[PDB]
Amino acid sequence: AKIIGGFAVSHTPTIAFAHDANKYDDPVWAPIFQGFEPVKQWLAEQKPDVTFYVYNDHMTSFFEHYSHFALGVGEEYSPADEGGGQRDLPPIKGDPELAKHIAECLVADEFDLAYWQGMGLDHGAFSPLSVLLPHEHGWPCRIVPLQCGVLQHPIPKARRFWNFGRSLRRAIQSYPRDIKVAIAGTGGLSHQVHGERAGFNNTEWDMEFMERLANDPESLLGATVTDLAKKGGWEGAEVVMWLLMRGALSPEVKTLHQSYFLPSMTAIATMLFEDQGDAAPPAESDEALRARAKRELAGVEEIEGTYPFTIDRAVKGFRINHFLHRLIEPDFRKRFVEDPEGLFAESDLTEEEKSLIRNRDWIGMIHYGVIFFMLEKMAAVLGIGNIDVYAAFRGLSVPEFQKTR
Amino acid sequence: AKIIGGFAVSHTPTIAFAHDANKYDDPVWAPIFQGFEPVKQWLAEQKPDVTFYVYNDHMTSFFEHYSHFALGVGEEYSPADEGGGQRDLPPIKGDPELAKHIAECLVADEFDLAYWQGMGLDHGAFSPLSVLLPHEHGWPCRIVPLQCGVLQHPIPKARRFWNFGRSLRRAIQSYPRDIKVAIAGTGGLSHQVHGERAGFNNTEWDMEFMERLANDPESLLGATVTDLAKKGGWEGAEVVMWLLMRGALSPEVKTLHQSYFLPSMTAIATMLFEDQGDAAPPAESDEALRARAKRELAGVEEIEGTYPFTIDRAVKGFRINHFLHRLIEPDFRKRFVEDPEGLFAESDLTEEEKSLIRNRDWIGMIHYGVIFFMLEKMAAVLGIGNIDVYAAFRGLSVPEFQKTRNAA
Ligand SMILES: [Fe+2]
Ligand SMILES: [Fe+2]
C-alpha cells in the first residue's frame, strides 16, 4: 500500500536483442545500457514487492479479442512465443490479491476492465524487465501487468488513461497490506514502423513530452491521437501509457533520472520518478474506499449455497476450468470420452483436480472453483443431463429433485 | 439512425432445444412459443436493418481473456461449438460500420471497450434468435453483438450498464445512415444453476423487475450484485443486461407485450418495448456528437505514409492478419517455411492475399490492411531483418535507409 515511485522506459525488442546478444561492450549499446543503470540500481535498493506494469502487447496474446484495459490477475507469466520461440527467462510471479483489490476499486470508479491469465507476456514486458531486473535465478519482485489496447482505434482518450492512473493510485494505496509498489509505464518514445513514413522521429517533441510528463502532466490531457501521431510517429502515440503511470504518482514528483538515445527506429528513453507521498489527505479515506470497493458483494456470504466466481476463485480454478474449456474442441472432447487418463497424464491437473473430474463430483467441483458453465460442458459431453447435475448439487436423487420443481 | 424499440428475452439454450425438437405443439411449450409470437411478428413487421444484441457468453468464446463490454466488429458470426458441435444455422452478418461508429461514440463518452471478430456467437445469441427470426437461408437483419462479462466479478455496477445504454442511444441515433435499429437485452430472469441453492426461482421478484424495468427503470439503478442475487438467484443477476437495453430506449416506452413461463430451472420471460422517440432535443446534437466522436482522429489523413489501424481496416485485413498471427504457433510457422502452398490451400485466404504473402510485398500488405506487427512475425520467421521491411516501406535500398539512422 505504499507507492514508492515509477519508471518510464521504452519497450522495443531491440533492447532485448542487444541484451541477449551481449552488447554491453558495444560502442553504440554501451552508453544506452548505462542509461538504464540508475533505474536498475533504484529498483535494487528500494526493493519493491510488486511492480504494477503498464505495457501493450504487439498483436501476440491479444488479437481476435482486443481490450482497452486488460488486468493480469494470474499466478505467474512467462514469455510469449512471438514467432521466434520462447525467450529463455524464468516465469515472473503475479499478484492475484493485489489485482483483485485493484479491479474492485477500478470498477467502483466506473472503469471497464478485462481480466486475463495463462497467456504469455510479449516483449512489451520482458524486453525492459530483463534489462532492469536480475532474472538469472528468479525475478526479485511480483508483477501486476496491465495491457493497454493502444493499437486498434478507437482507443481511450489521453485523459481516460490519466484518470485510470488517478484511480489506480487510490486502489494501490488503499490495499490493506504493508507493501512497496512501483509503477512502470512502457512504450515510446517517437517512432513509426509502418508505411512510407517509417523511420520518423521527433527528438524535440520527445524532450518536451518528457518535461511535460514530469512537471505538468495535466497540460497533455487534451492531446488527440492525431496530435501525438503527427508529433511522435504513429506508434509513438502509445506514450499515453506513460500518462497512465504518471497519473498513479504524486502530483509533484522528483525526476531522479532521464536518458535518451536514438540509434535506430525508436527513441529509447528512460525516466525515474520518486513518489513524493500526499501533500493533503485524499478526497476519500482508504477505509471508505475499501468499503466502496466492497459495496457490490457486501453480505454475499449470507446467500447460502452460493459460490461467487470472483477473481480469487478464477485463479484457484484456472487449471481445471482451462482443461474443461477445451471440451469445445472436437478432438479434445473425443479423447476425453475415449481415453480420459491419457489426457490426464499430459495435463497440468493436480490429483484432486483429476479425481474431481473422475468421480463426476459436481458439488465438489463447484466448491473447488470450477465455474458451472464448464461443468455443463462436461455433463453434455458425457451424455449426463443437467438435471442429474442440479440434483447432486442439492444432494438429492433426481425424482426427489423433480418433485421440488 | 432510428431506434424503433427493444425486446427483452431469456436466452436459455432450453429455448433452442425445444425449437430444434419441434415442441411447438407440446402442452408445456405451446403457450411458451405463443409468448414469443408478438416479438416475432413485431420484428417481421418493423424490419430493423440491424439488431444491437446484448448477451453474455457462457465461458465459450470468452474465458482466458474476459472483458466487460466486448463489441463484435466483424463481418459475420457463426454458432460457437459449446462442446456439442456446431448448431446447423446460417451465419448472421455483422455491421462493422455501425459498430465502428458506436465504438467511437462510447469511447468519446469514456466507456472502456473490447473489440472482437471471428469467434463463435454462442446460445446467448442463437437460442432466442433462432426462435424469433426466420433463417432458412439467411437472417433478416444484421447484428451488432455486445457481449457483457457478467460472470467474473467484479462486473460493472448496474448504473454503469444503464449509463452504457444511455450513451448507446446517442451513438446509434447519431449514426449517419437512415436505417432502423432494434435493441435486444437477453438473459434472466430468476434462476440459479450452481451450488446447494441451485433451483432457486422468485416469480414475485421476476414480475416486479419486469414492471419496474418497463415503468421506473431508474428505481433499479442502485441495485448491488448481492441484492440482485438474493432476489433472483446468482445467475438471475445477469438482468443488468436488460438495464443496458432499457437505457438505450426512450425514457418512457410503450410495453407492447410481455410474457412469463417457468417450466423448469429458468423463468422464461419476454418483453417488447416500442420507442417513443425524443420529447426534448438531446443535450448534445447529432451533428456535434459526430464531431466529438471524430475528434481523436480528425486531421489524421494529413499525415502522409500512415495507415491508421481502425476498426474498418481490422475487419478488412482480418483473414490475413489471423493467418499471419498463427506464425506464433510452432507447427504452423514450420509449415509456412517448408510448405506454404499446402498451408494456403487449407486457408480461407483470397488469391490476392496469398499473392501478397508469396511476393513478400511489405508495403502492399500495409496498404491492404495487414498490421505491421503481423508482418514483423512473417519477416522474422523468414530470416528477413526488420530494416529490410522499413527500407521496402520507404522505397529505398537497405543502406540508403540505414543512412537515415544514427547507427546501423
Ligand atoms: Fe508498444
Ligand atoms: Fe446468460
Numbering used by the authors:
A (entry chain B): 2 to 406
B (entry chain A): 2 to 409
Study authors write:
The three catecholic compounds are degraded by three evolutionarily related type II extradiol dioxygenases–DesB, LigAB, and DesZ–in S. sp. While LigAB is an α2β2-type tetramer, DesB is a β2-type homo-dimer. In this study, we analyzed the mechanism of the substrate recognition of DesB on the basis of the crystal structures of reaction intermediates.
The α and β subunits of LigAB correspond to residues 285−418 (C-terminal domain) and 2−284 (N-terminal domain) of DesB, respectively. The B-factors of the Fe (II) ions are comparable to those of ligand atoms; the averaged B-factor of the Fe (II) ions is 21.0 Å2 and that of the ligand atoms is 18.0 Å2, suggesting that most of the Fe (II) sites of DesB molecules in the crystal are occupied by Fe (II) ions. The R-site is the same as the Fe (II) site of the substrate-free form.
